[PDB]
Design a protein around this ligand. Structure first.
Ligand SMILES: [Zn+2]
Lengths: 242, 397, 273, 274, 132, 263, 132, 49
């Protein structure tokens, strides 16, 4: 409501906030890191390419690796390779409910269910929502029935598109298959999945969808069944707390 | 079903009593039984698996008998035997597992799998033998409709329940009175608290009570009862009943006064103990009632007097409690306990083969959910499934 | 209500309906009590207004807050009819008025139940550590005479008040305490005073006496044995009055959270019977 | 458990518990409010006393009943400090003072919640059919000026009160009602008046305005649509004042039964208020 | 081997872990968003912090199966072996830690210690059929 | 992070490293020394300090003559600083503001009152100003850079929150911009963020019934170990006690980790 | 057992419930958004509330199957057992409530009461083949 | 199973192959509509059969 050319220049101000924040610059970086990759010359502040060859996404992260100490190798790259893999990629191309689409939902929700929202506040708050929503989260890439899961921050696994399974995970096989293929915003991840597959019983049919993070098949359960699924979901809402 | 049983004790008493050396005479009675089997089987054909991630496997039979000739046993004799056993082992495993997954509402007691349904057939009954395995022992006695019974160490009769009840409360939660508890497995801990230390209570005594209703009767129970609930003897910040805020619990413990434990059966007191801590026997009960009081100390040294003022704020919260543990007991119904692997075996086979949730058991064979709504169907299915797990563990662990 | 009987459920669902400050911002009222000197030092015709806009920051809608001016601890003590949902009263210790202050705190910070007393016709008796005689008015002067079990004086003649024992000489608020379980012929100066028989108890889930000055301690206990320190008893370091108010505003919620509404359905809490 | 959290389950035990009047005779107080003219017509120095002995008949112990003298509907309508458990107020039909009477009834017969208003610094607005402005004092004169969504007058200049709209000219009790959801700069004569913002809640389980004379009315609804007739609103046919009191005494219980416990004051409360 | 075999989210009571070599317990302390005065008083905005917020978990393995021999709360094997060695003043050898110390043994449970332990446990069990 | 393994291996002593390696600086008021009236009191106490275990060249004696000057100049010289304060009832707060500074760890930046109107951010962002005569007037700005109860143009409409103090920790409603008007000629005002406390001072208070507030809010009252109190008799007695209990006082403090860029 | 087996939304008439131990009826009263004067008059904005808005449901189990014996509207078993006991002044025993009271019996339908009831009902049915 | 919400009036249920009128369900309809892809039936039953 109200909006005397507020939500207006404000839908514009909400803009004039975005292009000056987390999501902004970051996306503006990956972009260059490609141009500057092929085009000019790879700013070699040390650079690796865990995978076939150089390609911003994989490598530029494979290298850099700033501000994350106290554990094991893999995790650190995975992580730093997550950072762009995630967020950054989303504002581009992918399937099923994409994290943010769970976020937007949070916003268009409260920003209506609220009472304390004058125009001045509209900006920022929206922006800030992006930078601080679903602190972490991971992704996956299927290829020959092999769920490769870059559990951002920490963790990482693999699966048979059929039986699921803690099969060798490799910074390599990972490298490429990530770089240029479609990714998936793993709504529900392993933990919830394996626990789900057992005390329960996921038809090959379903499962195959529960990966692409299909809207339907997911909606079903949460709507129908109600076991676990209703936490992996909910917990996320609770996470987009900002 | 009983059929199944034999198949194993056959193999066990086999893979056990048959070795490079011993005299024939010690197995004569055995050897026979064995062969008898091979015969009845040969010619028949089977099928196991087909559900979830469980492989489908077909089996056929065409085996030679056993040399009832020899005096002693030569190495060669064994190896030619062990080779035949291993096919049956790898068989039974697949048979058990296949019937250890299927559930059924209507008749959740009888066999399910194409594999077993075929066994209950009459032509195979020619194999039963030595039913001393505690579980089968009780499986039979139940068919003939008679008094069964099992043995358990730290039984699992209490569904997990951890909560509180505020008998006196107010928004600030600065002068509460009530109880908090943890019922889980074979143990109960309950504390009664009164922020006012019974300052305005009749006889300066606040009465507390905790009642726990078992889903099945336990007989012959050996129980440890101790004063105090250590679990509720430390400072806590707890969520309010409505979840809208949090309250502070800062206990100071006093001895529970006029402790009375009653083990009731259908509303009748079967056993009652007044302030008796240590080991007590409850011979038959479906309910436990713990009554205890907080009595304001009539005489207090300065340090004590300082904790209990005549007016708020009440900063030290008088608490009395009890701890009760059922070490062992007998139940006419199967239950999970702290020693038997049955529940874990059934749950594990289902998890490993990604068996879909069925119509009888709660997702994941969740114990709390199961015991909370322990219907006749769940019990019949549980017993069938536990008995099969026990048959399997005679050969495969 | 109608309901207390039949206990709540103690199950630890464990959910905590987030916030609580967002319901109080919308639905409650905040009343600030200060002394004249406080406002005089501020010297602005718009201080109440400026602070109000500043109060929107902390989350209180325009028509929400207020400002009530007591000019002395003595006057503020007697005709205190706490007006709003939440009352935070500013007191700047004055060292000679300490007990005046103590008696006033004892009244606001606590929940009181009173009945009227007829000093003229009846000879009565204080019952427990919670039965006190709270009298207040223009000039309260109370003389007492303890009676033995015969209606006879003990160190006094129930006939000549010149033998009575004076326990209050012209105060504006007085909470009198006598040896429990003994009858007393009372002689108050009812012309300028009113004395009522009160039973104590419930505290106040509102006030928040904020003390300015000294090295402040208060002793609600009429006894010697106890000393209660509650959250609704805060203290601020004196610099200037503008600073005091800035702090009160900058920490409104913190101060409100130390109280908590829901306890305020009476004009004045001199509970009448 | 105090937390005004509620549950109760109505099994029909059907134990119809007996009397009810024998708890009220022992534990409660009865306060009779009348006008001066009432007592003046009685002309006895012992009327309060005679009636009191007569009250023992109906079952009220000596020290139980109190007699409060309002001399006018306007003054009585002022501080309203109902003294006793049960209050039955006698109102003599004065036809010119009808609304004075209506405004006073509306206050006693009902449960009110108020906050203070600062006419000086903040222009207010009423929220629902239950948010009213009850002002009272020596001489209450209220002028109002409706504000559009800019803090600008509508038919008035928020600067000169000579353009305001007068809605009360020197009353002793006034319940003002304005178009809901509109801000108004208010101009009361705070010198002699006090105006407070009240939200109407529960009703009163005490008063029992007994009306003498007319044919009668006194409607307490501000709207036009509703007309509520409650039990705590009784009427008596005037003859002589002695007769009125005799009847009030001869039917004390009947009158009390139409009121009872003043629920908002009942001990048993908490989150609901006292 | 790094793979999640069983996972339980906030499930207290009895749970089954069918095959594992590692247990990982993750839990959080969340500052109460709503606090009564008594609670608020424990958690100030500035130090000194005098009441220390603590969250915890308790996990007990009631029963399990292991492919290797282990000591447990019911079997007397470890105690039998340890007791015979102590009674006869048997000198410390090259395989077992001094006193057959369980913690030391399980901490560095080498193949040699396990093979010797199994041999030694099996003999203890043979002995207990006749001599207890 | 440190490994958490517990197996007890007490260090034994602690005080024998501090006796050897650290300095102790005693701050007192002039009146304190004047009452002592000896040309060798600093010396006598020093020999007495060897008893408690502090080598000759170890202990230093700094003379503040007032709480106001000392409050400005707390360029704490030694490893351990124990400051003696005299209960002056009119100066209480001055004392509070000085305690708040020594007892705590502060981070500050400079403020240009002339060109940029500021705002405090959290319960830890305060404006600490100090000097000859500190007089601070403030004017809150609405979201337009316009006054609220003031004209950003005439300081005669500002709100005075400090009239000529020697040390002042000013607090304004968080999240609001303010045009500030300090008397920069004699004052210096800097924007500080609070935090770490001090593992040194040990304000020892002489006299009163010494309870005093050191928080800006009303809700909290913090009582730390580095805040001690002694019963006044004579100054010689005070010092004897400080010496007789040096270690006890030192133990209530103990060497700093601040990686403070000011040094 | 807590699981929805059958659910019907606003379906009046004949419905089938195939297996259940609990019935849950949920329904609402919705204030009419549009009211003629006569209706509007019943529902004022302020008390007194003199006409009390009420919504309801009626559910009748015409027939069903139960694994346990029960009394119903056609069989004479309960009446036969109760009648024989009453006619011969049989003293109250340890199992059945006084007078074979149905409400008391079904309220606390213990295994013992059910086994005795079944035995006793089966005998009543054997008797009714010859004696009615 | 072609579920056809013939707006305004009508509604039919097929069997994607050998077409066939057949019980239409407000239920089966409910969901399968809510969250799945729909189709702007260019040509509908009438024309199709
Ligand atoms: Zn045990």
């Amino acid at each position: 409501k109200s909006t005397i050319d507020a939500a207006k220049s404000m839908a514009t101000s909400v803009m004039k906030k975005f292009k000056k924040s987390g999501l902004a610059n970051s996306v503006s970086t990956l972009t260059d890191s490609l141009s500057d990759a092929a085009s000019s010359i790879s700013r070699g502040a040390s650079i690796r390419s865990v995978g076939s060859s150089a390609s911003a996404w994989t490598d530029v992260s494979t290298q850099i690796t700033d501000v994350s100490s106290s554990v094991s190798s893999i995790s650190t790259q995975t992580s730093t390779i997550s950072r762009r893999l995630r967020l950054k990629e989303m504002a581009t191309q992918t399937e099923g409910m994409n994290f943010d689409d769970i976020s937007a939902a949070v916003l268009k929700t409260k920003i209506d269910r609220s009472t304390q929202i004058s125009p001045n506040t509209l900006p920022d708050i929206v922006t800030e929502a992006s930078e601080k929503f679903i602190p972490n989260r991971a992704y996956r890439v299927i290829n020959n029935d092999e769920v490769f899961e870059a559990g951002t921050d920490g963790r990482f696994f693999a699966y048979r598109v059929e039986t699921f399974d803690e099969i060798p995970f490799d910074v390599q096989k990972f490298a490429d298959l990530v770089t240029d293929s479609p990714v998936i915003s793993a709504i529900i991840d392993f933990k919830t999945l394996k626990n789900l597959n057992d005390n329960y019983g996921i038809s090959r049919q379903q499962a195959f969808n529960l990966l692409r993070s299909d809207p339907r098949v997911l909606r079903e359960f949460i709507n129908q069944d109600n076991p676990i699924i209703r936490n992996r979901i909910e917990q996320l809402i609770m996470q987009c707390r900002l | 079903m009983d059929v199944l049983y034999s198949l194993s004790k056959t193999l066990k008493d086999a893979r056990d009593k048959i070795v490079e050396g011993t005299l024939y005479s010690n197995v004569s009675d055995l050897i026979q039984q064995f062969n008898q089997m091979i015969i009845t089987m040969n010619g028949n054909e089977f099928q196991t698996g087909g559900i979830g991630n469980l492989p489908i496997r077909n089996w056929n039979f065409d085996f030679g008998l056993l040399g009832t000739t020899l005096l002693n046993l030569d190495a060669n004799y064994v190896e030619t035997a062990r080779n035949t056993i291993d096919y049956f082992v790898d068989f039974v495993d697949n048979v058990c597992m296949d019937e250890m997954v299927r559930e059924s509402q209507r008749n959740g007691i009888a066999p399910q799998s194409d594999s077993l349904r075929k066994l209950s057939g009459i032509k195979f009954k020619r194999i039963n033998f030595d039913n001393s395995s505690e579980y089968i022992e009780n499986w039979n006695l139940q068919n003939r409709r008679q008094r069964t019974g099992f043995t358990f160490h730290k039984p699992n009769i209490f569904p997990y329940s951890a909560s509180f009840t505020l008998n006196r409360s107010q928004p600030a939660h600065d002068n509460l009175m009530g109880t908090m508890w943890l019922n889980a497995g074979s143990e109960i801990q309950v504390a009664g608290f009164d922020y006012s230390c019974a300052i305005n209570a009749p006889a300066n005594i606040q009465q507390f009570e905790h009642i726990v209703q078992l889903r099945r009767v336990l007989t012959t129970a050996t129980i440890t009862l101790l004063p105090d609930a250590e679990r509720f003897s430390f400072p806590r910040v707890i969520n309010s009943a409505d979840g809208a805020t949090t309250w502070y619990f800062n206990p100071v413990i006093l001895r529970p006064n006029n402790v009375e434990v009653e083990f009731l059966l259908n509303g009748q007191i079967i056993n009652t103990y007044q302030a008796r801590f240590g080991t007590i026997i409850a011979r038959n009960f479906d309910t436990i009632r713990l009554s205890f009081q907080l009595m304001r100390p009539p005489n207090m040294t300065p340090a004590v007097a300082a904790l209990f003022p005549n007016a708020q704020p009440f900063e030290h919260h008088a608490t009395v409690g009890l701890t009760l543990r059922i070490e062992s007991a007998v139940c006419e119904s199967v239950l999970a306990d702290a020693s038997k692997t049955m529940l874990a075996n059934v749950t594990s086979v289902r998890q490993e083969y990604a068996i879909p949730v069925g119509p009888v058991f709660p997702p994941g064979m969740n114990w709390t959910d199961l015991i909370t709504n322990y219907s006749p169907s769940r019990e019949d299915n549980l017993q069938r499934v536990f008995t099969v797990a026990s048959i399997r563990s005679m050969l495969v662990k | 209500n109608y309901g207390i009987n039949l206990p709540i459920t103690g199950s630890m669902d464990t959910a905590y309906a987030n916030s609580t400050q967002e319901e109080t911002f919308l639905t409650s009222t905040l009343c600030l009590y200060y002394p004249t000197e406080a406002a005089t030092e501020i010297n602005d015709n718009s201080w109440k207004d400026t602070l109000s806009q500043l109060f929107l920051t902390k989350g209180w809608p325009t028509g929400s807050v207020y400002f009530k001016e007591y000019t002395d601890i003595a006057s503020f003590s007697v005709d205190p009819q706490l007006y709003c949902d939440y009352n935070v009263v500013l007191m700047k210790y004055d060292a000679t008025l300490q007990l005046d202050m103590s008696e006033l705190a004892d009244l606001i910070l606590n929940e009181w139940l009173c009945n009227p007393m007829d000093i003229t016709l009846y000879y009565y008796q204080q019952t427990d550590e919670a039965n006190k005689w709270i009298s207040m008015g223009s000039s309260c002067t109370i003389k007492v005479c303890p009676l033995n079990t015969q209606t006879l004086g003990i160190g006094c003649l129930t006939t000549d008040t010149a033998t009575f024992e004076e326990v209050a000489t012209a105060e504006k608020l007085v909470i009198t305490d006598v040896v429990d379980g003994v009858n007393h012929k009372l002689d108050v100066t009812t012309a300028t005073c009113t004395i009522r028989n009160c039973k104590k108890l419930g505290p106040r889930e509102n006030v928040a006496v904020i003390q300015v000055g000294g090295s402040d301690v208060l002793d609600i206990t009429a006894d010697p044995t106890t000393a209660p320190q509650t959250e609704r008893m805060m203290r601020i370091n004196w610099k200037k009055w503008w600073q005091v108010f800035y702090t009160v505003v900058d920490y409104v919620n913190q101060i409100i959270q130390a109280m908590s509404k829901r306890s305020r359905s009476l004009n004045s809490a001199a509970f009448y019977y």
